[PDB]
Write a protein that binds this ligand. Structure first.
Ligand SMILES: CN(C)CCCN(C)[C@H]1CCN(C(=O)c2[nH]c3cc(Cl)ccc3c2-c2c(-c3ccccc3)ncn2Cc2ccc(Cl)cc2)C1
Ligand SMILES: CN(C)CCCN(C)[C@H]1CCN(C(=O)c2[nH]c3cc(Cl)ccc3c2-c2c(-c3ccccc3)ncn2Cc2ccc(Cl)cc2)C1
Length: 83
């Protein structure tokens, strides 16, 4: 059960060490979490909060920040970026 991430999401996964074009959603989500850490987008003082307005991840979410505790914007992003 592989999808192909569209370029902007693919760039993001590759930026977290992913290789290739095809992934399971499990992989996608794991690399996304790693990306947030690699790029230090989460707040060390509020570790469920991600400030992504200056990052490609924000453009994809269409949001400047989100909470991993209530991660609503993620779902549509994945629908739009996974073929
Ligand atoms: C600063 N630390 C607190 C981070 C702990 C990270 N941790 C060990 C890993 C284990 C597998 N994880 C994930 O699969 C995971 N994937 C993500 C993908 C996104 Cl877009 C957002 C959050 C997470 C995300 C994730 C996060 C998270 C939080 C801050 C920075 C990076 C990742 N925390 C919990 N999760 C699990 C999760 C998965 C999916 C959703 Cl929708 C929500 C939460 C997190
Ligand atoms: C706007 N268009 C560009 C949309 C075309 C979409 N389409 C034709 C169907 C075909 C069947 N699909 C799914 O089962 C599927 N649909 C979703 C819708 C959303 Cl908002 C989020 C994830 C998935 C989601 C999904 C997938 C996935 C991956 C690749 C291709 C299709 C679907 N993988 C996991 N999910 C669901 C999901 C929901 C929440 C979380 Cl936290 C993680 C995964 C997609």
């Amino acid at each position: 059960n592989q999808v192909r991430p569209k370029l902007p999401l693919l760039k993001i996964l590759h930026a977290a060490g992913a290789q290739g074009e095809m992934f399971t959603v499990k992989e996608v989500m794991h690399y996304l979490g790693q990306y947030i850490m690699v790029k230090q987008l989460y707040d060390q003082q509020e570790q469920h909060m991600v400030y992504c307005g200056g990052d490609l991840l924000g453009e994809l979410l269409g949001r400047q920040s989100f909470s991993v505790k209530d991660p609503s914007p993620l779902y549509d992003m994945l629908r739009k970026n996974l073929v």
